[PDB]
Motif scaffolding. Sequence first.
Motif, PDB file in Angstrom:
ATOM      1  N   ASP A  37     -50.133  14.123   6.818  1.00  0.00           N
ATOM      2  CA  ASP A  37     -49.995  14.030   8.327  1.00  0.00           C
ATOM      3  C   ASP A  37     -51.520  13.635   8.790  1.00  0.00           C
ATOM      4  O   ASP A  37     -51.974  13.684   9.791  1.00  0.00           O
ATOM      5  CB  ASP A  37     -50.032  15.622   8.888  1.00  0.00           C
ATOM      6  CG  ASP A  37     -51.380  16.264   8.473  1.00  0.00           C
ATOM      7  OD1 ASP A  37     -51.947  16.290   7.385  1.00  0.00           O
ATOM      8  OD2 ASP A  37     -51.662  17.211   9.289  1.00  0.00           O
ATOM      9  N   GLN A  58     -47.651  11.890  11.369  1.00  0.00           N
ATOM     10  CA  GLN A  58     -48.505  12.369  12.180  1.00  0.00           C
ATOM     11  C   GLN A  58     -47.775  13.359  13.310  1.00  0.00           C
ATOM     12  O   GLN A  58     -46.878  13.030  14.026  1.00  0.00           O
ATOM     13  CB  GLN A  58     -49.688  11.647  12.965  1.00  0.00           C
ATOM     14  CG  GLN A  58     -50.286  10.584  11.707  1.00  0.00           C
ATOM     15  CD  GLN A  58     -51.428   9.845  12.312  1.00  0.00           C
ATOM     16  OE1 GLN A  58     -52.313  10.330  12.863  1.00  0.00           O
ATOM     17  NE2 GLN A  58     -51.428   8.558  12.176  1.00  0.00           N
ATOM     18  N   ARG A  59     -48.402  14.589  13.558  1.00  0.00           N
ATOM     19  CA  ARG A  59     -48.051  15.348  14.608  1.00  0.00           C
ATOM     20  C   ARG A  59     -48.052  14.675  15.922  1.00  0.00           C
ATOM     21  O   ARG A  59     -46.944  14.840  16.731  1.00  0.00           O
ATOM     22  CB  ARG A  59     -48.787  16.670  14.718  1.00  0.00           C
ATOM     23  CG  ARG A  59     -48.536  17.467  15.913  1.00  0.00           C
ATOM     24  CD  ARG A  59     -47.213  18.293  15.770  1.00  0.00           C
ATOM     25  NE  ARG A  59     -47.054  19.087  16.874  1.00  0.00           N
ATOM     26  CZ  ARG A  59     -46.645  18.550  18.066  1.00  0.00           C
ATOM     27  NH1 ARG A  59     -46.318  17.210  18.049  1.00  0.00           N
ATOM     28  NH2 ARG A  59     -46.383  19.357  19.109  1.00  0.00           N
TER      29      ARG A  59
END
Length: 216
Positions: A37, A58-59
């Motif tokens: 992430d 990625q968030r």
Amino acid sequence: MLKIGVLVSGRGSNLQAIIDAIESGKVNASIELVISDNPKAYAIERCKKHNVECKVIQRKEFPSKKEFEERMALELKKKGVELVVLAGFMRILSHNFLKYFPNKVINIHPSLIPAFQGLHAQKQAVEFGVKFSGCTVHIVDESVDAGPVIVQAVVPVLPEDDENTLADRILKWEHKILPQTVQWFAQDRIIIDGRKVIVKDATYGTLPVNPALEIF
Ligand SMILES: [Co+2]
Ligand SMILES: [Co+2]
Ligand SMILES: [Co+2]
Ligand SMILES: [Co+2]
Ligand SMILES: [Mg+2]
């Protein structure tokens, strides 16, 4: 072979231990996918050096956590991942992700849970002044390093130890109990009953690892 996926966020030394254990033939599994992430995690470089497929998810690329977790589960499912291993992963997984891998998501934590749960467990142990700490491989659930315990390794704490010195001592064992747990899953030896876990034909009542290591 057991097909596994590993979630990472940083240095990834635990991922390296699994990779090395597989390459040396100690663990009968294959890492079908590594998900980071963090685009700058050194763990990504490890995958390149060993030809392990890695994807950075990625968030911030998703408005909601639900979406974010769904994407990660789907990508693992597409690779036929049977066991999900968190190695230095820094995000908190919810039912959105866990429901897809019932009792098939594990993590390595640097303390003898339930003691010193959360971040900086090694430093917590040192400041508290315990005489024994160690590491735990456990099944991930909605608690914070409070899920089913598979195996633990005990490590003595020294009067002069600081966060880094103790962490270094514990890490030697993390690199052993996590790969061993993967192998145990690969051997279909993980039995779950309630929140308790038993390893088939394993040796119990031993120190410093219980149940005892076999591939190490
Ligand atoms: Co592939
Ligand atoms: Co990579
Ligand atoms: Co932890
Ligand atoms: Co001490
Ligand atoms: Mg790690």
